[PDB]
Amino acid sequence: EEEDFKTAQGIKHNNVHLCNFFDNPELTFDNVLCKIDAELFSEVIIQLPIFFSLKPSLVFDDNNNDIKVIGKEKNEVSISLALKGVYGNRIFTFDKNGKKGEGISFFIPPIKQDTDLKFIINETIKQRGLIYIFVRKNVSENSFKLCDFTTGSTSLMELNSQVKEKKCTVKIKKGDIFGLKCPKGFAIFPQACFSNVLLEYYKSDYEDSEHINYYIHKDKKYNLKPKDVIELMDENFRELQNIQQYTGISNITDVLHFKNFNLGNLPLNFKNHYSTAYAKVPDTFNSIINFSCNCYNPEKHVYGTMQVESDNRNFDNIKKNENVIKNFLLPNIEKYALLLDDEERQKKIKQQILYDSNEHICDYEKNESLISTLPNDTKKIQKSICKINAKALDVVTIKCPHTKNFTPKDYFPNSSLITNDKKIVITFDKKNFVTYIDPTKKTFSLKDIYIQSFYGVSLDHLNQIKKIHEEWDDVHLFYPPHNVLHNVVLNNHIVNLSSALEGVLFMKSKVTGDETATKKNTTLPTDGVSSILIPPYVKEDITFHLFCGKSTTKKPNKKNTSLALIHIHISSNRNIIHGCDFLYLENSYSIFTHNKLICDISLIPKTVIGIKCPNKKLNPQTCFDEVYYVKQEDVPSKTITADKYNTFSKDKIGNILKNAISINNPDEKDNTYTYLILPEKFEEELIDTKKVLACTCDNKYIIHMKIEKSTMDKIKIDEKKTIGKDICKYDVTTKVATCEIIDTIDSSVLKEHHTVHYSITLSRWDKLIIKYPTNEKTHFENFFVNPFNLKDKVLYNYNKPINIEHILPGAITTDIYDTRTKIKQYILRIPPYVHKDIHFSLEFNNSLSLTKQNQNIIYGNVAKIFIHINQGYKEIHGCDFTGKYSHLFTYSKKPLPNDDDICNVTIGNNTFSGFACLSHFELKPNNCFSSVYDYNEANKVKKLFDLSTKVELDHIKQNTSGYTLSYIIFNKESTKLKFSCTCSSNYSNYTIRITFDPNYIIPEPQSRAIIKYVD
Amino acid sequence: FCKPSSLNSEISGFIGYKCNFSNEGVHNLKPDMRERRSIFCTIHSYFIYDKIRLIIPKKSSSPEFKILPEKCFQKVYTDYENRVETDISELGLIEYEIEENDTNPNYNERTITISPFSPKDIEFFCFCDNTEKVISSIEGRSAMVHVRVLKYPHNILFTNLTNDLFTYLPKTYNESNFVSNVLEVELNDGELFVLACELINKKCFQEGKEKALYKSNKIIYHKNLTIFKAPFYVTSKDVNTECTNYKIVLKPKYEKKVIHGCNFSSNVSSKHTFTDSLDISLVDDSAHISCNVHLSEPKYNHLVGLNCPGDIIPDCFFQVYQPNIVYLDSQINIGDIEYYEDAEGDDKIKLFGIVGSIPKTTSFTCICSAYMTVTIDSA
């Protein structure tokens, strides 16, 4: 009976349907039919107090997540079966200001039929609440593309040992809604498809864009596939997150205005649920795209790939725009100037750790002509890039053009309104998050929690960012438009800078356009300038981006709107940085030693110490420049408070410590980190061991910066550090450089030399194997490498961690974690063509590990390896299909579409050969140049060592550029065969055919083009 | 019998010399922060029917590269003190091929194909300058592409068997000189023979009449000519090579060839008679035995090797030790270096031949404590 049910519509707000039975007077259990007219991609979130019991009774457990509904046949089924590919069925427990309860969340998939989910709430048994989710049909049969990997012809659940991939390809036109459904135990790959996809190809039409294209293509880094990742990894660590770290993540679909609806980095339990993903194409799509998402089980290593290429395949109807001129603005690097070292850097470098703080300016305020529309043609627009690569403990200042006396309007703090009356704590799988309610009709969203786990901001935060940039009535425009340098775009994600780059201090700089010459609060829309300081300890390599464009019209029209892209790459430099974190006491990274409310920090020469304190909540407002200079006998070490510190001396740190540089500018609203560079030398003439330089924090915690006398006496034994002479061994027949410097960095023995350097001069096709220990040994508990990512980065100019592919394109780098003895093997092979003389170094250091044996303390040593790579003028007679490897190979073609190409090369004895393809291409056969497609036995699989037992072979699937390289060299073989490999894609097919003939060689040009660099 | 135009197969990427200077290429002349050095491209060669490609972006989509002069392989530069746009025909190049393939949408593919017919060394320049572009007060980089075509030092054989006369060379043989329907050819060392014929067999010029195959790996089948490169070092005067009915038989004039080398060989059945023959295992295995090979010639046409057994380190003479390994052509700085590979029973014999004149001094070493150092002076 309709009159017997208290019918109420669901609260619809920000495409979120809410049925709040918890704190809403309309939905009260004092009588409840919560009917939700669920449209496409609408989040159904149900709130409840703690109960009485549900009819799909769900107990709170980690392994209990099978959310049940009731179908049309009145059978208690799973929601993954009643809704054809539901996504996001989660059970959470939420507390609002003390009052506890639970909630059920899911989303709505596109379905071609009519279905209804019934959630029945019961009591200890009457019927209490009936959440009737009415999901009507929203897609036709021809407007719904799908590849189920649970049944049909693409089922992996009955996959054999021989075949393991049921590849699917269904094409998408404009206005289509599509998705991917995975079976049980098979996680969606990568995390939150289709906002994370494995891209292969994307061709952009200019007429599709209704705004300016704010996408970062990285280094044209289309992503890999899981079939090509797991062949080169470790053994035990083969979970989903490591394979996702090794395969590359792209988020082009959110920039392309696809309606992507998923769960972010908080997915479901894949071992008990069908992980499902969806995306909606825009209605003005006339472009060509290609990507893939996977259903992957990382126990049996079974994958299903849904390679989706779009409907259009013609590359003549794509209106490639001629209005875009791409320009370059390289950033400027200057030596460190502190209003008196500006003259000192000028005087000393003219005659020629303060050298590791190099200042950077990317000046788009001055170079506005690269984002100004040229009067030679009004229709031409300009696009500019600015690639910045900097290390830790650096300072970088960004300049972008601005309107004078610009007022940033405060609608964004008006839309923030962050109070305590909206506080809801939501916990699932014993993991907590904090969320707020929109104060209009008591509405919140779990999509905001998924966005917070993905973008780092809230839902209303993202909406107000988009509306602030869309309603831009000013001339100069920014991306991200609010709070620039406190929000940055890293891997197409607007997130806070100091949250990601943990420990960043906003520096001060002179504001241009003002004659005061005073360093003040600088913000990029307001003053046209913003300075930041890089933290000393960086965990991983990161890269964030900015845009500051200028349009001649007052609107972002894109037919005259210019753009300036700032591309800052921050390298991970790993040392040990001392300090006292106050946030790990109460995931959050801590970069401090934390020698545990009284905090003792020993002053060491040539290091940086740091306090994570709130900016004005600590009792000295200039604490690192002030000092509570008091003796240790004055302070009771056990029974003390922060009030006695009120009765202490307040001498400055520039008087006692000679040139200790205290960096703390706490006047900003969001400064949480303070630092101090301790100088090169200490003196007992001004410092007593009892006399410490103390501070306090929040009137409860205290920090004592005392200096120990034995710690000062341990510095005073250093008198000899010479250079080693080619002690890295070289097996010259096998051409393998074996380096064993484990005993020199071992702190268990007495070592004469603290720092030694080993010089290696290599050539092409030479191997370098270095054995280095890890942090799970004896006498190696504080071992660190330099740089931290040796598989990708080296040390340019002895301190800067740079990518190896920008100086040696095509190096073969492999790190093997030997857990039988907990050591690591570094294996690096030079590609057969080396285009330039390359120098770098790799350092190992165990100087912070201690050996206190027989009342004698001995520390470790420093061992760095010099690497010189010579001029590899020998060209590779292979067939390139990448375009950028025209220096390596002879036949070079840009990867144009519809390029079904054949390349024919006949090789012989003692001659290099190989190929390069793009890494996302379908390699045929799997692992080319190992099991070749032999042509003399009519193009079938045959192992190369079966056909030729004296060959040499290497193959790297993906470097940092994103390409696949393979090389083969035959040495003293006299058979006759012929072998081919096919790089097959969804738009073009390439074939390389190499003929093995011993007495026939290619007629040589008998020299090489000598590339030389002069200065 | 077939025409020799497609007799040299259809293997692409035979260009070799490629002074790439493009934006997408890694030898870019753009202003950048990671590099602030100009790029060179210096070529010395006996240029036999190869080609040189310059991949240079065009003046469209902003004026990028100042190509000096603007028609580089139509008009080319002399020395920098008298830089005028001299024509491509004024130098002395005989039967060249110039291709200004700009039909690709990204670059001006300028290709030059040079025949070895010249009485003198021909040196020419094409500058690629980008100093007009100033980005963040850092200017662009320059390139000074410099090709120095060298004359073939050995004599060249060119006979007549076609209807059309060419007369770029003094004629040696013809069909009236075809004595007794059999051509007996006596090459000296490494020469090339040009039979102007349009119909030769598909598997000819690859075998021998008496014994084995007197051949090298640089047989060039031109569209109107037929040229094979003779090998620099041969075993004995018992092999020949013949193709065809006009029968032409080619055999080497094998004299007693002398090769410099330490040659610590244990087998007395060695066909290679080197200069030195000091043994390695006769002395004790504790002395630092060093072998010195000093080369000082004005015109190098030399052939240096070794015959010591065991293991040869490094892969000589592909990579050689620094005076720490480096390539032989990177230290010699002269192209056209021949190498011979020998697979004997016990002793390992390796040899290389250098023809030309080196600019600088290189003293490279190969270790067989047996050390063999080969020094060649600048002179």
Topology readout:
The complex is a heterodimer of chains A (1015) and B (379).
Chain A: E1 7-9, E2 11-13, E3 16-20, E4 33-38, E5 43-49, E6 53-54, E7 68-70, E8 76-78, H1 79-82, E9 90-96, E10 99-106, E11 115-122, E12 127-135, E13 144-148, E14 177-181, E15 187-189, E16 198-203, H2 240-247, H3 252-255, E17 259-261, E18 276-280, E19 288-297, E20 302-309, E21 324-328, E22 332-334, H4 341-351, E23 359-363, E24 381-390, E25 395-399, H5 411-416, E26 424-428, E27 431-435, H6 446-454, H7 459-470, E28 476-479, E29 487-490, E30 494-496, H8 497-500, E31 505-506, E32 509-510, E33 519-520, E34 529-533, E35 542-550, E36 563-570, E37 578-581, E38 598-600, E39 607-612, E40 628-631, H9 653-656, E41 661-663, E42 674-678, E43 691-697, E44 701-704, H10 709-713, E45 729-731, E46 736-740, E47 755-762, E48 767-773, E49 784-786, E50 793-796, E51 800-803, E52 812-818, E53 823-829, E54 838-845, E55 850-853, E56 856-859, E57 862-869, E58 876-880, E59 889-891, E60 901-907, E61 912-918, E62 922-924, E63 931-934, E64 940-943, H11 944-947, E65 951-956, E66 963-970, E67 977-984, E68 989-996, E69 1010-1014
Parallel strand pairs in A: 1-4, 3-5, 4-12, 13-14, 21-24, 23-25, 24-36, 37-39, 38-44, 46-48, 47-57, 58-59, 58-61, 60-68
Antiparallel strand pairs in A: 2-3, 5-10, 6-11, 7-8, 9-10, 9-26, 11-12, 14-18, 15-19, 16-19, 17-18, 19-20, 22-23, 25-34, 26-27, 28-35, 29-30, 29-35, 31-34, 32-33, 35-36, 39-42, 40-43, 41-42, 43-44, 45-46, 48-53, 49-54, 50-51, 52-53, 54-57, 55-56, 61-66, 62-67, 63-64, 63-67, 65-66, 67-68
Chain B: E1 38-45, E2 50-56, E3 66-68, E4 75-76, E5 86-87, E6 97-101, E7 108-114, E8 122-129, E9 134-135, E10 138-139, E11 143-149, E12 156-160, E13 182-187, E14 192-196, E15 227-229, E16 241-243, E17 247-252, E18 289-295, E19 300-306, E20 319-321, E21 325-327, H1 328-332, E22 337-341, E23 350-356, E24 362-367, E25 370-376
Parallel strand pairs in B: 1-11, 12-14, 13-17, 18-25
Antiparallel strand pairs in B: 2-7, 3-8, 4-5, 6-7, 8-11, 9-10, 14-15, 16-17, 19-23, 20-21, 22-23, 24-25
